C-alpha cells in the first residue's frame, strides 16, 4: 500500500538522523496539517541554543505524511 | 540549508529502492507541481504490466521537493 511506503520511510528518516547538535537524541517534531515537521535538534539542544544565543542549527524539514499529494 | 537536507534525502530515497518489479532498474518519476512523484516501477516494467494485465505494482509516492510546506 503506497501510504505505508511513505510512513515506513518517515520512520526510517526520523530514526537514522539524530539531533544535528548532540548527535545522539532523536529530533523534536510536530504534526503540521498533512505534514510531519522534523526539527533539526532535539528539544533539550533547541532550548539550550536559545539560552546560548546560537541560531546556527535552527530549522526543520516538512514531510507530506501521505503517498498522494 | 534545510532545502538541501530534503534534496539529499530524495536523492537517497530514489537511489536505494529500485523498481519493485525487476528489483534492478531505477523507478520512473515525474515532477508534479512542488512534488516529486516516484512511481513504483521503472518504465519498462510499467509498460509490460499493462501488456500482461497486472495492476498489482501500480502506484507511486509523492514527495514535497522543499523543506518548508
Ligand atoms: N527543536 C528544534 N530544532 C531546531 N529548530 C527549531 C526547533 N524547534 C523550533 N525550531 C525553529 O523555530 C522556528 C519556529 O518553528 P515553528 O514550527 O514553531 O514555526 P511556525 O511555522 O511559526 O509555527 P507556529 O507559529 O504555529 O509555532 C523555526 O525556525 C524552526 O525551525
Ligand atoms: N512507472 C510506473 N510504475 C507504477 N505505477 C505507475 C507508473 N506510471 C504510472 N503509474 C500509475 O498510473 C496511474 C496514473 O499515474 P499519473 O501520475 O499519470 O496520474 P494522474 O494524477 O492521473 O496524472 P495525469 O492525469 O496528469 O497523467 C497511477 O495509478 C500511477 O501510480
Ligand atoms: Cl514528503
Ligand atoms: Zn540534541
Ligand atoms: Zn523494472
Numbering used by the authors:
A (entry chain A), B (entry chain A): 5 to 73
Question: Mind quoting what the paper says about this structure?
Answer:
Protein DX is the double-mutant protein isolated by optimizing protein 18-19 for improved folding stability. We determined the X-ray crystal structures of protein 18-19 and the evolutionarily optimized variant, protein DX, to resolution limits of 2.8 Å and 1.65 Å, respectively. The structure for protein DX was initially solved by molecular replacement using the coordinates from protein 18-19, and later solved independently using single anomalous dispersion techniques. The Cα backbone trace of proteins 18-19 and DX can be superimposed with a root mean square deviation (r.m.s.d.) of 0.51 Å from residues 7 to 71. From this comparison, we found that protein DX exhibits significantly greater thermal stability than protein 18-19 (79.5°C versus 57.5°C, respectively). The Asp32 and Val65 amino acid mutations identified during the evolutionary optimization of protein 18-19 are located on opposite sides and faces of the β-sheet. The largest structural change occurs as a result of the D65V mutation, which eliminates the R21-D65 salt bridge, causing a significant repositioning of the Arg21 side chain. By comparison, the Asn→Asp mutation at position 32 does not alter the protein backbone, but instead results in an ion pair between Asp32 and adjacent Lys47, that is critical to balancing the dense positive charge present in the ATP ligand binding site. Indeed a slight repositioning of the Lys47 sidechain toward the purine nucleobase can be seen in the crystal structure of protein DX. The results from these experiments revealed that mutations N32D and D65V, located at solvent exposed positions, significantly enhance protein expression, solubility, thermal stability, and ligand binding affinity.
